Short mmCIF file of C-alpha atoms and ligand atoms in Angstrom, two decimals:
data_model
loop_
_atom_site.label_atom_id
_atom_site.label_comp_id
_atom_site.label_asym_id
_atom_site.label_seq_id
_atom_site.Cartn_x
_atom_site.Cartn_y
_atom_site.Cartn_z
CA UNK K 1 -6.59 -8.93 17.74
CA UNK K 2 -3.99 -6.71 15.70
CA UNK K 3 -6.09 -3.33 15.61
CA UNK K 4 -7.88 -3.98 19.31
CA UNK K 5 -4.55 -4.29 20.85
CA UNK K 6 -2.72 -1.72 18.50
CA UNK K 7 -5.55 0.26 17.97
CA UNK K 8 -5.05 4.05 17.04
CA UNK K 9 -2.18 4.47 14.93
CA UNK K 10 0.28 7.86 14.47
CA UNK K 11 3.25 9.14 13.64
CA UNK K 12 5.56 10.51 16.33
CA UNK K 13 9.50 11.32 15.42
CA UNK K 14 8.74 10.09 12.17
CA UNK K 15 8.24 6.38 13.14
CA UNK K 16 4.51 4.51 12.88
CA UNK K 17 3.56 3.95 16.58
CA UNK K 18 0.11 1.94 18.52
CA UNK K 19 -2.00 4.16 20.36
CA UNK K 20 0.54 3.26 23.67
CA UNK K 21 3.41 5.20 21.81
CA UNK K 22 4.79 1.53 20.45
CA UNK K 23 6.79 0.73 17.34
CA UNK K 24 4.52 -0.92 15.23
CA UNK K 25 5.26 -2.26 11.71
CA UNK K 26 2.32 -3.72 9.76
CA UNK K 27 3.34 -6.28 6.91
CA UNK K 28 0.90 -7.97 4.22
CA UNK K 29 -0.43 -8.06 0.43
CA UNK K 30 -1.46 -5.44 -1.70
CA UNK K 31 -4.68 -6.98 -4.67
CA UNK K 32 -3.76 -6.31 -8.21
CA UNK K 33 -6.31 -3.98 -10.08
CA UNK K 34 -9.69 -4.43 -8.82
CA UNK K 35 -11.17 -4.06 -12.06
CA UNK K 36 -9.16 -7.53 -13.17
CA UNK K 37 -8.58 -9.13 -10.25
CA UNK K 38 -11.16 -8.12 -7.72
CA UNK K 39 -12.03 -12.17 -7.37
CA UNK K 40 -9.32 -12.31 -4.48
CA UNK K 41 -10.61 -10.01 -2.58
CA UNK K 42 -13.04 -11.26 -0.08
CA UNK K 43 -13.48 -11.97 3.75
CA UNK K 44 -12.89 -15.65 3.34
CA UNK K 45 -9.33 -15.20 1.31
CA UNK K 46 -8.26 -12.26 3.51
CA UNK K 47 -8.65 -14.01 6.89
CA UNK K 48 -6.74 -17.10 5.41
CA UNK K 49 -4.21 -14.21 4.58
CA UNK K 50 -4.47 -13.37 8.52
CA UNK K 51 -5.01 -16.74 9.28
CA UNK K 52 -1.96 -18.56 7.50
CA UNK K 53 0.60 -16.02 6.60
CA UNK K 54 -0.12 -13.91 10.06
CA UNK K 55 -0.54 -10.37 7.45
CA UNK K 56 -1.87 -7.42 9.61
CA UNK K 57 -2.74 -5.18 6.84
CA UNK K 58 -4.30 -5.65 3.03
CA UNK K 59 -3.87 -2.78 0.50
CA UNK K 60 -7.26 -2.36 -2.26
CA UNK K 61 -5.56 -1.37 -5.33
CA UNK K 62 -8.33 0.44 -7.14
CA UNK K 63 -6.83 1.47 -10.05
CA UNK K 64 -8.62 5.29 -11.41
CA UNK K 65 -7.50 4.41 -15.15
CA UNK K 66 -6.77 0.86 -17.33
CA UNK K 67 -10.14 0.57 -16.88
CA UNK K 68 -10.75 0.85 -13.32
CA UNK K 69 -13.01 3.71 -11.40
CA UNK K 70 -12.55 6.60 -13.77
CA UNK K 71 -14.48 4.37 -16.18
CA UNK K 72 -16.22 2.15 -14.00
CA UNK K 73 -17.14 3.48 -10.17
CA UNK K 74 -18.74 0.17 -9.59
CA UNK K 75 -15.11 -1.04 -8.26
CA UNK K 76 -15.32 1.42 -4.77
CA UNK K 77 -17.71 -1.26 -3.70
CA UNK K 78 -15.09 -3.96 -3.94
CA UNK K 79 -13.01 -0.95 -1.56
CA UNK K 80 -15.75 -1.35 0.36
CA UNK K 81 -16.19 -4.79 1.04
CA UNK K 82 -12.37 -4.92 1.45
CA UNK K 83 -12.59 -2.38 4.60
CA UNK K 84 -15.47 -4.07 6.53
CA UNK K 85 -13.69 -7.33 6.15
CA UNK K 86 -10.63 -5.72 7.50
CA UNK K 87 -12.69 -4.61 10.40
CA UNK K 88 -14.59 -8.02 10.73
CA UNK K 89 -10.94 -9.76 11.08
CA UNK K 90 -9.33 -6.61 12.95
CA UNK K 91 -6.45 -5.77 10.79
CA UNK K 92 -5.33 -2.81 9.49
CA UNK K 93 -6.83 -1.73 5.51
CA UNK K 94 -5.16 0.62 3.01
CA UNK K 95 -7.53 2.59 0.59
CA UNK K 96 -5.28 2.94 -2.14
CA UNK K 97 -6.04 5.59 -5.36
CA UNK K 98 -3.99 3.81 -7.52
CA UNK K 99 -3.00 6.16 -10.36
CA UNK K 100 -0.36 4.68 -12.97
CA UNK K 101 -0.76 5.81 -16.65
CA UNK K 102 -3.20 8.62 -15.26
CA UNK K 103 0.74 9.95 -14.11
CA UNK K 104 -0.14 13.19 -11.94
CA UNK K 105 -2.37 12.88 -9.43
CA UNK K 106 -4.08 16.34 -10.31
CA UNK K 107 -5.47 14.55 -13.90
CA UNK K 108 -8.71 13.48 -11.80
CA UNK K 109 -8.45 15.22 -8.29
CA UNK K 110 -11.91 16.27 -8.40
CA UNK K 111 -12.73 12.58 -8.70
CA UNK K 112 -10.56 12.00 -5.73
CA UNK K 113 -11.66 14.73 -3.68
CA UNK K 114 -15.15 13.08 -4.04
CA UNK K 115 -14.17 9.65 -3.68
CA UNK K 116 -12.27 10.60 -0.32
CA UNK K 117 -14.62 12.28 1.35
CA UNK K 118 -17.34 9.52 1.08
CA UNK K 119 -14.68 7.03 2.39
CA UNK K 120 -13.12 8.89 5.17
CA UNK K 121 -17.52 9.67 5.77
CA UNK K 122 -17.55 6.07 5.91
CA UNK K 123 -14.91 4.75 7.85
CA UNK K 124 -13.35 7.49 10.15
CA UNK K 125 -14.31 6.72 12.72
CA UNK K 126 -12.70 3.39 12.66
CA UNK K 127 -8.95 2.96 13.54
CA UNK K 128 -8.10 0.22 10.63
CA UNK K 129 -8.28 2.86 7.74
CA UNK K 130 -5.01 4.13 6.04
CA UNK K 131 -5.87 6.26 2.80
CA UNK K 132 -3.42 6.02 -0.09
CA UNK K 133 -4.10 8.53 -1.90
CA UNK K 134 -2.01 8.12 -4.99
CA UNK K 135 -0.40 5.18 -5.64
CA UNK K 136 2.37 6.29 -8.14
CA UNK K 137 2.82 9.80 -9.59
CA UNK K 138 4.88 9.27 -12.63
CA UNK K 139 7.15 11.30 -15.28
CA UNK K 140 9.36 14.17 -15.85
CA UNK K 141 6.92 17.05 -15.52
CA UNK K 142 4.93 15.70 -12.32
CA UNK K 143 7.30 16.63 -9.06
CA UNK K 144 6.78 17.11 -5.40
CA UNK K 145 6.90 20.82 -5.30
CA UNK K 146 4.18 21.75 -7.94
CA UNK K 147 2.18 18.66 -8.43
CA UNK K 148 2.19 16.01 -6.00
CA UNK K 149 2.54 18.40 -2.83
CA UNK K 150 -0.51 20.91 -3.73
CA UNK K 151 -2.69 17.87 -4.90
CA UNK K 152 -1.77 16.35 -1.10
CA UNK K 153 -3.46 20.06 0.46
CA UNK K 154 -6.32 19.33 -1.59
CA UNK K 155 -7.00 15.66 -1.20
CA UNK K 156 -5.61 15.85 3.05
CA UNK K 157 -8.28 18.66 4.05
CA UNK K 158 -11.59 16.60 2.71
CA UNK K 159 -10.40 13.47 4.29
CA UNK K 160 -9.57 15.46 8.05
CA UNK K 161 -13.02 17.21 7.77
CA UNK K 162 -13.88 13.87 8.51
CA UNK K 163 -11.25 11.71 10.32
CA UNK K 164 -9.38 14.24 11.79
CA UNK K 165 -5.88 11.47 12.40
CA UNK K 166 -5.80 8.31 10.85
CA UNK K 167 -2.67 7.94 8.70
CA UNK K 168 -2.40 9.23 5.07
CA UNK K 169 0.38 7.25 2.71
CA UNK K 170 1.34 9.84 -0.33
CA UNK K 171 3.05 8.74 -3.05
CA UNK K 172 6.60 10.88 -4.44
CA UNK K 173 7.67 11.56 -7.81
CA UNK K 174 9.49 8.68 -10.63
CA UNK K 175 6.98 5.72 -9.56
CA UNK K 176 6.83 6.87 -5.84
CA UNK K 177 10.47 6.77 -5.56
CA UNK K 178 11.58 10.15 -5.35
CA UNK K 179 11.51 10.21 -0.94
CA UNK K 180 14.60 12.53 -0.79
CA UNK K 181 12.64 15.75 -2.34
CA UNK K 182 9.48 15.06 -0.54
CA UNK K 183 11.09 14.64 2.56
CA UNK K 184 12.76 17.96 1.75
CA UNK K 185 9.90 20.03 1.66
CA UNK K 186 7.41 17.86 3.91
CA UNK K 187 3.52 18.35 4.36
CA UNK K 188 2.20 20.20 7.87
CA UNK K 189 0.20 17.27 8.92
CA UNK K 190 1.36 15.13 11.16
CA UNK K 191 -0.07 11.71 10.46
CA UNK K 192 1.50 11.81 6.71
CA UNK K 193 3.65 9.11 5.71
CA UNK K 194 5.43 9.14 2.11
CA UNK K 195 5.04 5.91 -0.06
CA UNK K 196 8.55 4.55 -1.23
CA UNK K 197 7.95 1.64 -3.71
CA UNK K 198 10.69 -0.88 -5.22
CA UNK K 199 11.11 -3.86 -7.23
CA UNK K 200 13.65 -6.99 -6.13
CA UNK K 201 14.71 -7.04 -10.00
CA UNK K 202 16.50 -3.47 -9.72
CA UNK K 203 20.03 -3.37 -7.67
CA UNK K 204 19.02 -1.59 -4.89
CA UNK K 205 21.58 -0.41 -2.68
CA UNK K 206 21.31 3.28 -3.61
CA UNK K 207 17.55 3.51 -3.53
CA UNK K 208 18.15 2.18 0.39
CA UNK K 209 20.95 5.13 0.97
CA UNK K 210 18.11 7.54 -0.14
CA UNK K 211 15.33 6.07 2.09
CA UNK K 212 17.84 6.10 4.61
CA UNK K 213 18.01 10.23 4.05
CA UNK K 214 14.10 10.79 4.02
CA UNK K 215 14.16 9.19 7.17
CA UNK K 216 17.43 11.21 8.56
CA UNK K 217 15.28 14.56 7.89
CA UNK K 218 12.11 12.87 9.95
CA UNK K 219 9.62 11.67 7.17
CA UNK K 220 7.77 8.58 8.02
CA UNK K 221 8.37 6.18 5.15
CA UNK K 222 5.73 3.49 3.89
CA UNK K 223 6.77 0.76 1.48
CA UNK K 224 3.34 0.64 0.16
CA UNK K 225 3.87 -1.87 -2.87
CA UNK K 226 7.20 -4.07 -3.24
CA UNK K 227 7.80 -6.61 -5.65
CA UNK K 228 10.44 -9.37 -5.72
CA UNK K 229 10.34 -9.04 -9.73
CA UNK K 230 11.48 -6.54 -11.97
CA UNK K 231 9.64 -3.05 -11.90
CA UNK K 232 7.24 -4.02 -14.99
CA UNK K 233 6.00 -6.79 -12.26
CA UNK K 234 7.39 -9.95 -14.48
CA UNK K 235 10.82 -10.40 -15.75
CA UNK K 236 12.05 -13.12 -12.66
CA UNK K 237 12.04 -13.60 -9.37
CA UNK K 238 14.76 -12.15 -7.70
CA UNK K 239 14.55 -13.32 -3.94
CA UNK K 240 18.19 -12.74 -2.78
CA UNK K 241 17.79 -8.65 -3.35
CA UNK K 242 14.72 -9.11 -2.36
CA UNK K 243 15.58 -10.55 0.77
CA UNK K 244 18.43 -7.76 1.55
CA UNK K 245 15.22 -5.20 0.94
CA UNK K 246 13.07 -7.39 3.51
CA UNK K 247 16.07 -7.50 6.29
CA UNK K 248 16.73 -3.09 5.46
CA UNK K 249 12.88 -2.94 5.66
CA UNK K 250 13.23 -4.59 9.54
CA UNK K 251 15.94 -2.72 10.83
CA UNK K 252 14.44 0.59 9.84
CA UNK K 253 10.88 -0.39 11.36
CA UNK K 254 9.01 -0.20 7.68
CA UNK K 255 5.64 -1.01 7.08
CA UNK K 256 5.07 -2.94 3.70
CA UNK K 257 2.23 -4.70 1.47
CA UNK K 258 3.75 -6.66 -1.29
CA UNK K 259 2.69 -6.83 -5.29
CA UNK K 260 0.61 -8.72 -5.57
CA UNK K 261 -2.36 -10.89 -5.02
CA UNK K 262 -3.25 -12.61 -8.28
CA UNK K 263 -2.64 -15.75 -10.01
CA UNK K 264 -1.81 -13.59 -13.25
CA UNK K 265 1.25 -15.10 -15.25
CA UNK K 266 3.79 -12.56 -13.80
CA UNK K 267 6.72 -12.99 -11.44
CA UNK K 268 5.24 -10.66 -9.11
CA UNK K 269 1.89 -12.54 -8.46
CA UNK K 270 1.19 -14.69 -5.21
CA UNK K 271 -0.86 -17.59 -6.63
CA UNK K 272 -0.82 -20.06 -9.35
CA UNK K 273 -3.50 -20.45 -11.52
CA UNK K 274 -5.26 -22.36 -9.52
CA UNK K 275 -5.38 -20.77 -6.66
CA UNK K 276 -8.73 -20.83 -5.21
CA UNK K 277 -10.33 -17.03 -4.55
CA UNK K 278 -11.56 -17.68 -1.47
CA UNK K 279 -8.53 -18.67 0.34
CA UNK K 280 -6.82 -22.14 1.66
CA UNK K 281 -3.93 -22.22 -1.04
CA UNK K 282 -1.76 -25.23 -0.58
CA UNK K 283 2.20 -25.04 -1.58
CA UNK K 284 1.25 -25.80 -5.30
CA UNK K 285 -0.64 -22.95 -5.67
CA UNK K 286 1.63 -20.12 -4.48
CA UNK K 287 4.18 -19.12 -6.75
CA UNK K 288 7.54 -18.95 -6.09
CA UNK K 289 7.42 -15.57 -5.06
CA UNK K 290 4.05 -16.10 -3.27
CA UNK K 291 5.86 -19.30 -0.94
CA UNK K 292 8.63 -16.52 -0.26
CA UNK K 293 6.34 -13.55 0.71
CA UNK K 294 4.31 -16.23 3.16
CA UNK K 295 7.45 -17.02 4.65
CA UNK K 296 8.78 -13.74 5.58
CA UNK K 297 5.20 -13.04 6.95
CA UNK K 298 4.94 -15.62 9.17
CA UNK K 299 8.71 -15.81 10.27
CA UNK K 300 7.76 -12.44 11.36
O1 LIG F 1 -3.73 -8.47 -16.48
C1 LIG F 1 -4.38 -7.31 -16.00
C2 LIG F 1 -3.74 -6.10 -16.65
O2 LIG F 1 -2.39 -6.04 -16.11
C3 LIG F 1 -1.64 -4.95 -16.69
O3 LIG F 1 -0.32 -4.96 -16.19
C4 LIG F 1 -0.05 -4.65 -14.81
C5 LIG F 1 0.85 -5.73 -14.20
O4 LIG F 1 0.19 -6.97 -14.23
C6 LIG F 1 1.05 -5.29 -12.72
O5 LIG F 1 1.91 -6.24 -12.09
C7 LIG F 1 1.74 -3.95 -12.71
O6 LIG F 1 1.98 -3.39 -11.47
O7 LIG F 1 0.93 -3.01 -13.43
C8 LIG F 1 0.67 -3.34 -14.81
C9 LIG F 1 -0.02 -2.18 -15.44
O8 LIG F 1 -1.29 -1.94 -14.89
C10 LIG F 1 -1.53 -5.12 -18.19
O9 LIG F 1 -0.76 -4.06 -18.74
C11 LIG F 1 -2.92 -5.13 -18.82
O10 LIG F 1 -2.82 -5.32 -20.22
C12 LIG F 1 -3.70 -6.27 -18.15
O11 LIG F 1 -5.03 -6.37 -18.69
#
């Protein structure tokens, strides 16, 4: 009964609160590409999520590029499905635009603007929804101030014609990383949250100083994708940084879906290959970093 007890969610003095004013801090797994992967995604594998690792949200990665809805719409449907069983099991659901080589998010805003508006048509009026609206904004010439900012005032506008207050996640510049200028020169609407992303395999103690900052000048901060590898999503396991970035993410109240649920041949997946796609995984078929993710979950 996450979402009937917690129900409406906001932001007030930059923190994610329940409808009662409440800290609340949701915590669970993020697919892969829905275009690869979509196979794990599915009522009966996201209430053993609920279920067995106690996760009160689950992010849909639908990639827009790498063959995902740019090239293939048919994958919103897999969104779809992923929302209603979100709202069948009453946890929370991120709607995630997950742009990656397509590295500003103004490449296929029309496509987004679209693809918003018939979600937030959808599902406003339901309190589980959290749009995402792009996952990563990426490289030298994409920044806050002239790309990622204005494509937020587009994107923001068609979803609140709609669903006037459930929470938005933005991404920030270098890989959603780049908190300190967005929290700088923040958006007017008060249900915004940026997306701050890292990866176990990268020292982090400086990235934590600068989330630290973002949340010093009163942006609400969601770790919308973590992984305890190395930021290409393979590379290791690296579970004692990892677990510094879990403890951080605890004391500062953050919200987080970790990268991700697959049984791909990559640190950062979940499963083995095995792993059935419906659900009731036993130790042997979660990965090492899978078995650590379920732990932190449930010891939660
Ligand atoms: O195997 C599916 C698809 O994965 C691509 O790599 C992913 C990686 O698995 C994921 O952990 C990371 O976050 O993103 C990359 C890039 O999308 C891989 O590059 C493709 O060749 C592959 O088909």
């Amino acid at each position: 009964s996450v979402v009937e007890e917690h129900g409406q969610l906001s932001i007030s003095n930059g923190e994610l609160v329940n409808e009662r004013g409440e800290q609340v801090q949701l915590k669970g797994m993020s697919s892969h590409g829905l275009q690869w992967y979509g196979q794990f995604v599915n009522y009966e594998s996201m209430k053993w999520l609920r279920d067995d690792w106690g996760i009160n949200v689950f992010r849909a990665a639908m990639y827009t590029s790498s063959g995902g809805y740019i090239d293939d719409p048919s994958v919103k449907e897999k969104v779809k499905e992923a929302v209603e069983a979100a709202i069948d099991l009453d946890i929370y659901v991120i709607i995630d635009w997950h742009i990656l080589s397509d590295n500003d998010p103004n490449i296929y805003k029309e496509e987004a603007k679209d693809f918003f508006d018939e979600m937030s048509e959808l599902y406003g009026d339901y309190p589980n929804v959290i749009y995402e609206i792009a996952n990563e904004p990426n490289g030298s010439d994409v920044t806050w101030g002239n790309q990622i900012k204005p494509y937020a005032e587009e994107v923001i506008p068609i979803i609140r014609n709609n669903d006037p207050n459930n929470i938005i996640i933005v991404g920030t510049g270098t890989w959603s990383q780049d908190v300190h200028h967005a929290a700088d020169n923040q958006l007017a609407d008060p249900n915004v949250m940026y997306a701050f992303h890292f990866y176990a395999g990268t020292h982090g103690q400086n990235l934590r100083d600068q989330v630290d900052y973002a949340l010093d000048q009163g942006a609400a901060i969601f770790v919308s994708e973590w992984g305890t590898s190395a930021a290409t999503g393979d590379g290791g396991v690296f579970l004692d940084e990892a677990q510094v970035w879990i403890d951080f993410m605890d004391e500062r109240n953050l919200s987080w879906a970790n990268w991700s649920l697959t049984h791909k041949d990559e640190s950062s997946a979940a499963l083995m290959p095995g792993a059935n796609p419906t659900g009731g995984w036993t130790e042997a078929e979660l990965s090492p970093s899978g078995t650590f993710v379920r732990e932190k979950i449930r010891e939660s």
